[PDB]
Symmetry: C4
Subunit: 332 residues, 4 copies
């Protein structure tokens, strides 16, 4: 594999069509899904030359820990849909690559089993029908060693996934929500979580500048600027199009991550040049899992690491902080 | 049916080609017809998160009455072209969905019969060869219980519909203008109508900011910002591209509706975020009528209601007024 | 025929390929040829409603004479390439339609024969190897009753027409330059012409704002804002993209015409809304001549007249002057 | 051959696929390779008319010598890949056309042999693992009569050329680096070169305005604004998009060349109108070499000379300096 697109071809071959569609699809007409790619393709980097590259490092510090790249595995529910080892395969590869892995509320292996793999696990929260149960998942995650709570704030309910409707898609009987034996979140829910944990709370799914500012005021340790991979509001702006304005409004008050359509180390460089602290990567990780299990995810992360180091050095950046100081130009 | 595009496929199968072309076509090269869709596809919404969605309502108050959605059925002449029950099928479905239905001057069932269905009928006026006859249709509509006069102001004559010319299209003998046993309108005609009725007068086909302002000064209760579905001047700007500037110039002085290419609840959300009070929907209603009669229109309106509620909630809007306060960003 | 595009299809059928290519082609990669169409397609008109249309007139006064439309036939060399009656067929149709016809220096029938047809003949000048001969053609044109001298200023030499090179195109022996038994023009050549005639001198091929201003200072009665149909500099900006800036800089000091890609009455409306006094139309007139001779040109001009009247009225314009006061908006 | 595109078709026929891919390809997704062409296609020239063209000259003075066109042959490694005479064929054609030829560090014929051909040889430097060896190549080039040192500053290492990876491309045994029996460059390396030679030092691969300014401060005699033909950072902005801003920031302090996608004399005109002193041309020269050896390169340079003279005169420019004063407009 020499690009992330090699892995998509491989995953399309192996997966059942309805599972590939559950993975690939977006809501509505898929306008926001396509726009995430369009938006990144319009960004061009203005590289710098002739800088010292003797010790190029792709490492960052985030939420108290070093990470090997400015990247984490995005939360993706039900990873046993894609490979029998599901989340354990992905978490082991992420641990070995030094990349944080986001354990999902709707994981198909329990959060404690995935946390026991080690590494830097974060935990993604969906707000449940009652405050006490929500907070119990948060406490389980914290007890299990998760390092951050990634509270998804863009899913008061699931979007209209027309591929899934047309396919009549349902979970196979062999895939379950292993953390179990949902409700719209509000700013009150954020405060309940913030009061219940010492872990940093990261709000995933922020697009309005005013919501990024309120996230900082609310005590969030980070936000993920994101339209949920085009799976929630069809017509929501891409996160990459709001990122620069959000980074300026936040003034360093929290970490600002972005996701949606990151498909290469050059895309990671674009996101960092627009001001991101780090990116999330979703679908490509599942392509690698589907294609070749744990080893596939390892190969994907090795390729991304090579592409990030290559792009940074070609752009004159010995560190991720230098990459954040790059300028960009929109093209056509 | 899971999108409005499902209904177009269904209507193309059933209708005779020349009738499908009368419905689908525009004037000239169809540049304005295509632009209505291009323009909406360029608009992206910036959704808000974490707001109270306990009682999301899609209802509005307009021209004195509650409507279940910020939407009305646009005037479309000669609906018996599409189904034998014609206007009565559409009006019954609109009534049952709580959506206003616009009765046309060129309806193929008399305005009194369609008004007797109940619901919230509006009446669309074409200016006739003489003031007294025009005003008689207005008085008939008012006597029959219509709630608003939708005066079409963009048809001094019919545009050049090249599909119809190439097809040699003419009305079948079984379709007639049932209100009967035309001239360019002017601002004088508007005043004659305004003086002849206590109903709100809504000018349909306004695109210039100065004409929206004059409409308010003339005592209009509303305007529809519209290029007539691309059927009148080929090269006329889409209404959606003038809407924001018109809403700002009107300063709340009248209701500002828009039409042209609304094909989903997400498009309704875009129109409201640009400042519309409500939209009109034309061709999709006729697709549903052609595909499945009254039940088809009911299914279309149920689908649109679900899509509007979904889009509003995903965008953090518990009411249409909140949706009007959303910001937008143009994309590519 | 219901559009000008019907005539292009007809002309492609009848003409030999190399003659169709001489007509259709541009220089280089044909980027400027395509851009003339792209540019017009990007312009949208903001029409006005509710104005008095009791006496819509498409007439203008230009260079001292009434014309039936804001349009003249562009200079096109060697019209016997397209039909045996060549220029006489086109000039007769233009006369009968009330449209000025531009007689070319390289006409395949003598300028005196074409002038004898009557109508409103203008005369297009190419600057010859010597001032005295150039001025003799000007004097011949004036003696023959031509009303304006259209001095082509964008042909110091012919552009690189790769279709013609690839085809090895040459004039058939049956087509000749009938005014005969060339050099780069300069501002000195313009003054020599201006001093030699009382007719208005119109500089065809102006694109720079500074050249439009100098044309007025030099005593030109008009300019044609034009990239020569994409046949001269490949990469020259379309005239329609410079027109508004040129109209503002000229401040009424001369007539400002435009050409390049006018293919409908709606395109004439766009040009007038951007400030043109009138347009030239080139290739479509030759399509009609090739398809059906004099009667073909008559049908083309009747169609254009109908399309111009339709577009003007739909845009609320009772006169060409009102159309020049329309606003426009660029789209995608 | 009537366009440079004729030569590409010819070269694709003759070369082995993997060698054609080594020549044609870029890094990553080839976004920057495509953007170099997109960017030039968006630029339109505003030509001037009616100027004196009695003695149009395409000549420039650069780095102390007259050149026949505002163009030099870009450095392209390993030219024996394309034809058995390799660099000697290209250098002989460049000499005979009066065009500077850039001898590469990785030439497949020694720099002294290519310099002995005569003409105006420049020498391109890659920074080697140690300062003394780098400086020895510089001294060899100077001793051999090269006129300028073109220091490549955008290759701390080679980009990720996925065509080459997929093809498993390697140099045939019959092609070698004939100057031999590499390390990231820095501003310190530039100063070491500048101190070691009296020749002008030209930094190739500058895109950031701040790096152009620093190049002047560092004593560079020129820069080449360039993304390395899309072969280095995938996503680097095209040089043509940074050129105008760089020319303004440099204020005449050094020569400012550009490369990337120049494929016609009209493209040379666009580059000069945006402010370039001269362009480099890479791939087309190798197409001509592959198609027909020395004579092919001669034909390419004759065609480019004709296209540059044609474009300049059609734009009203008697000299390259006048072409630099042309204005441009971006189109779509
Ligand atoms: C199959 C699938 C399942 C997902 N499940 C979740 C989830 O449980 N929680 C969440 O916050 N995001 C979920 N996401 C959204 C991702 O975290 C991410 O925002 C999105 O996929 C955009 O990134 P991409 O283009 O790299 O895939 C899911 C995405 C996919 C494709
Ligand atoms: C077949 C057809 C007939 C129409 N008849 C009328 C009419 O009688 N009066 C009117 O004001 N608009 C008429 N319209 C215009 C519509 O009210 C509406 O402005 C237009 O179709 C744009 O909406 P759409 O894209 O949703 O179809 C007609 C449109 C169609 C397609
Ligand atoms: C076949 C042909 C011959 C032309 N000959 C002349 C000419 O002799 N003199 C001139 O000034 N323009 C000449 N033109 C340019 C036209 O007058 C006009 O500027 C151009 O065709 C753009 O208009 P169009 O897109 O309507 O064709 C010629 C154009 C064509 C296609
Ligand atoms: C096959 C190939 C080899 C090249 N080798 C070199 C090189 O050794 N040194 C260098 O500075 N640039 C090298 N370049 C870059 C060119 O000098 C030039 O920047 C680039 O090809 C863009 O120009 P074009 O679009 O005209 O090809 C190479 C380009 C190609 C295609
Ligand atoms: O995008 C997604 O699939 C998730 O965020 C969530 F909405 C979801 C989880 C599991 C099944 C369907 C939906
Ligand atoms: O409004 C802005 O500045 C940004 O959204 C815009 F430039 C942008 C478009 C596409 C990708 C990233 C940024
Ligand atoms: O767009 C339309 O069809 C209507 O507004 C009107 F112009 C019209 C009604 C009936 C037949 C033809 C045209
Ligand atoms: O001029 C403006 O602000 C609007 O017309 C423009 F942004 C726009 C383009 C396309 C859809 C809606 C709006
Ligand atoms: O565009 C054109 O064909 C004319 O303006 C002129 F350049 C010309 C006339 C006759 C033959 C070739 C060229
Ligand atoms: O620069 C400007 O204002 C005009 O050239 C531009 F808007 C334009 C683009 C395309 C067609 C007409 C005008
Ligand atoms: O673009 C290129 O091929 C050159 O600049 C250089 F990176 C290179 C030279 C020779 C082989 C591979 C790469
Ligand atoms: O930012 C600018 O002014 C230039 O990069 C831009 F206009 C440009 C786009 C494409 C080609 C050359 C220039």
């Amino acid at each position: 594999y020499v690009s992330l697109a090699d892995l998509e071809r491989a995953a399309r071959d192996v997966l059942p069509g309805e599972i590939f569609d559950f993975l690939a699809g977006g809501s509505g007409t898929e306008a926001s899904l396509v726009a995430n790619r369009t938006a990144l393709e319009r960004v061009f980097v203005i590289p710098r030359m002739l800088r010292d590259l003797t010790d190029v490092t792709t490492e960052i510090d985030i939420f108290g820990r070093r990470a090997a790249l400015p990247m984490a595995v995005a939360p993706v529910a039900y990873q046993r849909l894609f490979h029998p080892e599901g989340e354990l395969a992905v978490a082991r590869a992420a641990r070995d690559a030094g990349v944080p892995y986001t354990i999902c509320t709707l994981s198909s292996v329990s959060l404690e089993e995935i946390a026991a793999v080690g590494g830097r696990p974060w935990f993604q929260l969906f707000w449940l029908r009652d405050e006490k149960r929500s907070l119990d998942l948060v406490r389980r995650a914290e007890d299990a060693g998760c390092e951050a709570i990634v509270f998804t704030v863009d899913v008061p309910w699931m979007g209209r996934r027309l591929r899934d409707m047309r396919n009549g898609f349902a979970l196979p009987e062999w895939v379950t929500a292993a953390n179990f034996d949902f409700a719209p979140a509000t700013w009150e829910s954020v405060e309940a979580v913030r009061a219940h944990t010492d872990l940093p709370v990261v709000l995933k799914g922020i697009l309005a500048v005013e919501d990024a500012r309120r996230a900082v005021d609310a005590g969030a340790g980070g936000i993920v600027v994101s339209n949920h991979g085009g799976r929630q509001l069809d017509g929501a702006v891409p996160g990459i199009e709001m990122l620069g304005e959000i980074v300026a409004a936040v003034s360093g008050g929290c970490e600002v991550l972005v996701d949606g359509g990151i498909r290469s180390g050059g895309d990671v460089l674009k996101a960092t040049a627009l001001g991101a602290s780090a990116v999330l990567v979703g679908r490509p990780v599942m392509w690698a899992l589907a294609a070749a299990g744990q080893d596939g995810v390892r190969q994907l992360l090795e390729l991304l690491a090579e592409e990030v180091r290559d792009a940074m050095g070609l752009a004159g950046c010995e560190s991720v902080g230098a990459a954040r100081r790059l300028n960009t130009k929109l093209g056509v």
